[PDB]
């Protein structure tokens, strides 16, 4: 089945309901849960949630941050490998 915290037309609650045109209507389904094929009994099956461990905004974020931290690590590995002489000439 499916579950979501806020199937809603309001941005404060995720903007999952989208209007491409001006509208006189608003809606919110707090903890919306739905199942509409291969149901059995009156009991819901296990639900896929609308919110996983990641999101499109987070993947774009991490694939930059946890990419440029590889590059910054190259920066950091060479800069931390700076050395100085222990002696000077006669």
């Amino acid at each position: 089945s499916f579950h979501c915290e806020y199937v809603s037309s309001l941005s404060k609650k995720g903007s999952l309901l989208v209007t491409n045109v001006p509208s006189l209507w608003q809606m919110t389904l707090h903890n919306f849960q739905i199942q509409a094929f291969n149901v059995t009994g009156e009991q819901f099956s296990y639900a896929s949630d609308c919110a996983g461990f990641f999101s499109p905004g987070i993947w774009m974020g991490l694939l930059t941050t946890l990419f440029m931290l590889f590059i910054f690590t190259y920066g950091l590995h060479m800069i931390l490998s700076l050395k100085t002489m222990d002696r000077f000439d006669d």
Binding site: S48, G52, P56, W59, L63, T73, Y74, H77, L80
Partner: protein, 203 residues
């Protein structure tokens, strides 16, 4: 030691967690998560395109810098006892710089392919547009890493040539053929990135 243990520790902990996650999502029957389709679809095509452009430069420049520091340090170190070195051996620097130029050409070509979609939905974006994003990433990464390895190669063999030349001048032109076989690698990175780019259009 400490930075090697840090990178090994991160690498091991990362891949150990991907093994545990791969097993756990499999056995719990969560194959409707781990949706690589969702990842590649909702991750914006502009990201892939621009990582391609910026890497085509910066990995080529990281190769050419590595190349310059390697051959340029032997040039200077041998040039103390053999002042003749500074002229002829400069070709190994010019071939390092050629690897960056191969980068710049290919990144400018990829940049000229980048365009605004004005779309925010996968079907509205459409196949040509995802295909541009990925093929531009691939072209840029292909040239970028092929030039990285070519720069590492040219500087290394240029150090070889300059340390040999310092001992016997007649060796330089005979050895210098190896920098041509090095510089071929960057050019092949460019030819592939050209072909990966040749069919794309964003819009």
């Amino acid at each position: 030691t400490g930075l090697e243990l840090l990178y090994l520790g991160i690498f091991v902990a990362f891949w150990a967690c991907m093994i545990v996650v791969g097993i756990c999502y499999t056995i719990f029957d969560l194959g409707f998560r781990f949706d690589v389709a969702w990842f590649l679809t909702e991750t914006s095509p502009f990201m892939w395109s621009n990582l391609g452009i910026g890497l085509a430069i910066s990995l080529s420049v990281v190769g050419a810098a590595w190349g310059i520091y390697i051959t340029g340090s032997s040039i200077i170190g041998g040039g103390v006892k053999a002042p003749r070195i500074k002229t002829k051996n400069l070709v190994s620097i010019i071939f390092c710089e050629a690897v960056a130029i191969y980068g710049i050409i290919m990144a400018i070509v990829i940049s000229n392919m980048a365009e605004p979609f004005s779309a925010t939905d996968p079907k509205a974006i459409g196949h040509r547009n995802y295909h541009a994003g990925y093929s531009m990433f691939g072209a840029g990464l292909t040239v970028g890493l092929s030039n990285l390895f070519c720069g590492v190669c040219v500087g290394i063999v240029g150090s070889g040539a300059a340390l040999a030349d310092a001992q016997n001048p007649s060796l330089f032109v005979k050895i210098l053929i190896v920098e041509i076989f090095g510089s071929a690698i960057g050019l092949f990175g460019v030819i592939v990135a050209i072909l990966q780019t040749s069919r794309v259009k964003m819009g």
